[PDB]
Amino acid sequence: IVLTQSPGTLSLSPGETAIISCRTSQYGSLAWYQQRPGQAPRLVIYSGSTRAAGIPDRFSGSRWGPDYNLTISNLESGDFGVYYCQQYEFFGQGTKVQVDIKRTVAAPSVFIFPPSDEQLKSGTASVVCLLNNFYPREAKVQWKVDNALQSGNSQESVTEQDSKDSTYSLSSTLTLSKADYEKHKVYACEVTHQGLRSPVTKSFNR
Amino acid sequence: QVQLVQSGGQMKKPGESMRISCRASGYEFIDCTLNWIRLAPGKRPEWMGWLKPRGGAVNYARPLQGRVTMTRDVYSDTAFLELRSLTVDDTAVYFCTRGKNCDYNWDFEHWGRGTPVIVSSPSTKGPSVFPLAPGTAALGCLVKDYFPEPVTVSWNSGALTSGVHTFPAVLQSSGLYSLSSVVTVPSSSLGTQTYICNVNHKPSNTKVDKKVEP
Amino acid sequence: TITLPCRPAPPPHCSSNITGLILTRDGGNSNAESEIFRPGGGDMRDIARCQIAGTVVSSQLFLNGSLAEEEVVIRSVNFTDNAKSICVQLATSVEIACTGAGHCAISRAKWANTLKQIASKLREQFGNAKTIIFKQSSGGDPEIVTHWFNCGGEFFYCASTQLFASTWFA
Ligand SMILES: *[C@@H]1O[C@H](CO)[C@@H](O[C@@H]2O[C@H](CO)[C@@H](O[C@@H]3O[C@H](CO[C@H]4O[C@H](CO[C@H]5O[C@H](CO)[C@@H](O)[C@H](O)[C@@H]5O)[C@@H](O)[C@H](O[C@H]5O[C@H](CO)[C@@H](O)[C@H](O)[C@@H]5O[C@H]5O[C@H](CO)[C@@H](O)[C@H](O)[C@@H]5O)[C@@H]4O)[C@@H](O)[C@H](O[C@H]4O[C@H](CO)[C@@H](O)[C@H](O)[C@@H]4O[C@H]4O[C@H](CO)[C@@H](O)[C@H](O)[C@@H]4O)[C@@H]3O)[C@H](O)[C@H]2NC(C)=O)[C@H](O)[C@H]1NC(C)=O
Ligand SMILES: *[C@@H]1O[C@H](CO)[C@@H](O)[C@H](O)[C@H]1NC(C)=O
Ligand SMILES: *[C@@H]1O[C@H](CO)[C@@H](O)[C@H](O)[C@H]1NC(C)=O
């Protein structure tokens, strides 16, 4: 029995509502814990919608079927941090309400990097997808090999919102080994973003 | 006013045993079931077991079944957690908790300040640096398969500041961190200027310098 | 016929019928292939809340208590809650016999039959078909770990380590 929280990282400015979702796989009262940086985690909501001690009415829990929502009506500094959902002994992966300076929308400049030949000798092969200077942080990257989607073989990372830019950059590390890699000749990285009219694709041949 | 005061942070070597105390006052100790939860960075919270003080009844989480043992002392109002056969995975901040109400066990209102443990194998893995090469162009370095955190990269020994983005490391299934560090430069510049990234990894004392040739 | 290491040796009149028992359920989950069950792990409030008890004060095993009609009946406040004790009541009792020599004998085949009934009912509650493991207690005081009961104002400690060491499939 597992608990799935979405989104993984929710980011937005102070003074606006934050909404977190937790999908359950079984019945049983569900709790919500806030964890500020460096501090012990704090019980926010229990039994679905009832608030614990010292929790303001800006926090509310909502449930429909197997889905649970924690909505924080008015974001204050103390609310930012990482939230977990719980059902009996099991926890959700977590969500990270972090600050986000609002600015104009910027489309990502995309680059694709074929694996180093020396790495290819070592037996492995890492294709990298770079997305630079885009707003907002929410953006989807899709790995296709010979026009075929891939799952779980890839990993991601996003920069802190760069002070000058107020803009996010993302790196997607697609990892394979020499065998599978050489077999498929052609690879493509697909980027879908708010500031983008059409899903920009960046590809290459072996 | 319930208080859960626990032991101070520890450093342990891999394969060793660990004992942590947690004494509590503000409520009648024998009444409420006590739990242990470890929080690993970038990892799901994990419940270790509960311990019912009246008779010392105990329920260990199944993944930890062999290596976890927790006991209690009724008279000084305290509970002890013991973790044997430590592995680098087991580095976490360890909390003792008690529920809001005395027996619905799972609404953890009360937490200790936490006891951070750090098992770190003297075995370290040097970074493997692999170049990334192509209006404007981008070229970078892939710092793959190193251990443990952290590494600090730079460019041209610090001559390059603008356009450089170093990314938070990523834990591959290998158990080894791999991050990337890219920089955007003019397309013309590819021929004119040489671009060297400087990977500095203090845990292994390795300091790799790598060139990104077009 | 399984015997019990018992301290101290229990006189013949202490020999009695077993009515039910207390099972604590090991916290999951791994993969829902199997479930682990252990005796006791139940506070006195759990025992009282169970309401099947007789006169005899005991841990792990209900003694001299009321039987339930036809099928073995399992009850808990919430089965998905592993912090809550599972109460098991039997339609057919199991006569635990103490010689007075220090070892309490018991019908092994009969206890196998009752256990199979319990496992069947546990599957009914915990999903159509999960393999069920019966292991000895995780730890605690002798009264919780060992089967402990009171006879004539005197306490006795018997080890159910031999008892709870089974595994059932379906
Ligand atoms: C251990 O303890 C825990 C608690 O800590 C126990 O967990 C509880 O277990 C309960 C029973 O197992 C369980 O009740 C269920 O819940 C079902 C789901 O409930 C949610 O979803 C409802 C809508 O679902 C629809 O959509 C989803 C997906 O979209 C589908 O999966 C569904 O099939 C539907 O299509 C939703 O309405 C409901 O909210 C109501 O209830 C909340 C209570 O928490 C209220 O806060 C909320 O406002 C809603 O209240 C409305 O409805 C109630 C009446 O239900 C009414 O009093 C209010 O005034 C208001 O009008 C959740 O969001 C749900 O489908 C079940 O309901 C059916 O079965 C019951 C009988 O049990 C019927 O009386 C009822 O009419 C309904 O009939 C359906 O089933 C019939 C046959 O079963 C069938 O004939 C008929 O056609 C219908 O299909 C039932 O309530 C709890 O949800 C759960 N609690 C938690 C927190 O998880 C756990 O069980 C314990 N463990 C053990 C082992 O005992
Ligand atoms: C239980 O009942 C039997 C007969 O019903 C009796 O002999 C015995 O003394 C009672 N008490 C115990 C602890 O067995
Ligand atoms: C247990 O109960 C049976 C009948 O229910 C009875 O014959 C027997 O004497 C009782 N006591 C023992 C120790 O078996």
Contact of C86 with C75, CB cutoff 8 Å: yes
* B85 plus B16 within the same structural domain: yes
Interface contact B68, partner C, CB < 8 A:
no
Which of B99, B121, B143 is the C-terminal boundary of a domain?
B121
Whole-number Å distance, alpha carbon C19 to ligand 3 midpoint, is: 11
* B28 plus B78 within the same structural domain: yes
Give the strand pairing for B115-119 and B10-12.
parallel
Question: Are C139 and B103 within 8 A, CB to CB?
Answer: no
Instruction: Compute the CA torsion angle A23, A26, A30, A36 (nearest 10 deg).
Output: -50
Q: Kindly report the protein residue whose alpha carbon is nearest to atom 4 of ligand 2.
A: C16
Distance CA A111, CA B185 (A): 12
* B71 plus B168 within the same structural domain: no
Whole-number Å distance, alpha carbon A141 to ligand 1 midpoint, is: 38
CB-CB neighbours of A107 under 10 Å:
17
Residues contacting residue C123 through CB under 8 Å, at least 6 positions apart: C129, C130, C132, C170
Domain count, chain B: 2
Which one-letter DSSP state was computed for residue A39? S
Q: Return residues 4-23 of B near A (CB < 8 Å).
A: none
Q: How far apart are the first and last CA of chain C?
A: 25
> Quick one: how far is CA B18 from the chain centroid?
17
In B, which residues are within 8 Å of C139 by CB distance? 56, 58, 69, 71
* B22 plus B103 within the same structural domain: yes
Q: Which two tokens stand for residue B46?
A: 């994990």
In A, which residues are within 8 Å of C82 by CB distance? 88-89
Which of B98, B121, B144 is the C-terminal boundary of a domain?
B121
| Resolution of the experimental model, in Å, one decimal | 3.2
- Give me the domains of chain A, ranges plus CATH numbers: 1-107 (2.60.40.10), 108-206 (2.60.40.10)
Distance CA C123, CA C116 (A): 11
Question: Are C80 and A90 within 8 A, CB to CB?
Answer: no
CB-CB neighbours of C105 under 10 Å:
16
Burial of C169 from C-beta contacts in 10 A (0-12 / 13-18 / 19+): exposed
Interface contact A188, partner B, CB < 8 A:
no
List the subunits that have 3+ CB pairs under 8 angstroms with B. A, C
* B1 plus B98 within the same structural domain: yes
Contact of A190 with A199, CB cutoff 8 Å: yes
Does an H or E element contain B46, and which?
A: strand B46-52
In B, which residues are within 8 Å of A53 by CB distance? 100, 109
Interface contact B102, partner C, CB < 8 A:
no
- Structural domain of B16: 1-121
Residues in a beta bridge with B95: B37
Distance CA C66, CA C88 (A): 11
> What atom in ligand 1 is closest to the CA of residue A27?
98
Q: Is C17 in the pocket of ligand 3 (CB under 6 A)?
A: yes
* B137 plus B188 within the same structural domain: yes
Instruction: Count how many pairs of residues, chain A against chain C, have C-beta atoms within 8 Å.
Output: 16
Distance CA A165, CA A103 (A): 9
User: What are the CA-CA distances from residue A53 to residues A42, A63, B158, B208 (Å)?
Assistant: 10, 21, 51, 52
Distance CA B80, CA B20 (A): 6
* B73 plus B50 within the same structural domain: yes
Q: Return residues 80-139 of C near A (CB < 8 Å).
A: 80-82
Residues contacting residue C143 through CB under 8 Å, at least 6 positions apart: B55, C59, C157
Question: Are A90 and C81 within 8 A, CB to CB?
Answer: no
* B85 plus B101 within the same structural domain: yes
User: How close does chain C come to A121, measured CA to CA in Å?
Assistant: 39
What single letter denotes the amino acid at residue A29?
Answer: S
Contact of B81 with B48, CB cutoff 8 Å: yes
Sheet holding C6-7, edge to edge: C6-7, C154-158, C147-151
> What atom in ligand 3 is closest to the CA of residue C96?
13
Whole-number Å distance, alpha carbon C12 to ligand 2 midpoint, is: 10
> Quick one: how far is CA A29 from the chain centroid?
26
* B127 plus B51 within the same structural domain: no
What single letter denotes the amino acid at residue B152?
Answer: T
Q: Which two tokens stand for residue A6?
A: 């979405």
Distance CA A43, CA B186 (A): 51
> Quick one: how far is CA B177 from the chain centroid?
12
ω before C11 within 30° of 0 (cis)?
A: no
Distance CA A150, CA A168 (A): 24
CATH number for the domain spanning B30: value is: 2.60.40.10
Mutate to test the pocket of ligand 1, among C25, C76, C80 (most ligand atoms within 8 A of CB): C80
* B113 plus B183 within the same structural domain: no
Interface test with A, best of C26, C35, C81 (most A CBs within 10 A): C81
Which one-letter DSSP state was computed for residue B175? S
Distance CA A83, CA B102 (A): 24
H/E/C letters for each residue in chain C?
CECCEEECCCCHHHCEEEEEEEEEECCCCCCCCEEEEEECCCCHHHHHHHCCCCCCCECCEEECCCCCCCCCEEECCCCCCCCCCEEEEEEEEEEEEECCCCEEEECHHHHHHHHHHHHHHHHHHHCCCCEEEECCCCCCCHHHHCEEEEECCEEEEECCCCCCCEEECC
Distance CA C36, CA C133 (A): 5
* B112 plus B199 within the same structural domain: no
> What atom in ligand 3 is closest to the CA of residue C16?
13
Nearest Cα to Cα of residue C30 among B43, A1, B87: A1
Considering only CA atoms, give the Rg of chain C: 15
Which of B121, B151, B181 is the C-terminal boundary of a domain?
B121
Question: Are B59 and C83 within 8 A, CB to CB?
Answer: yes
Q: Return residues 35-54 of B near A (CB < 8 Å).
A: 39, 44-47
**For residue B102, is it left (φ>0), alpha (ψ between -120 and 50) or beta?**
alpha
Distance CA B55, CA C94 (A): 26
* B40 plus B112 within the same structural domain: yes
Contact of C104 with C9, CB cutoff 8 Å: no
Q: Which two tokens stand for residue B30?
A: 């024998």
User: What are the CA-CA distances from residue B174 to residues A121, A175, B165, B171 (Å)?
Assistant: 18, 11, 24, 8
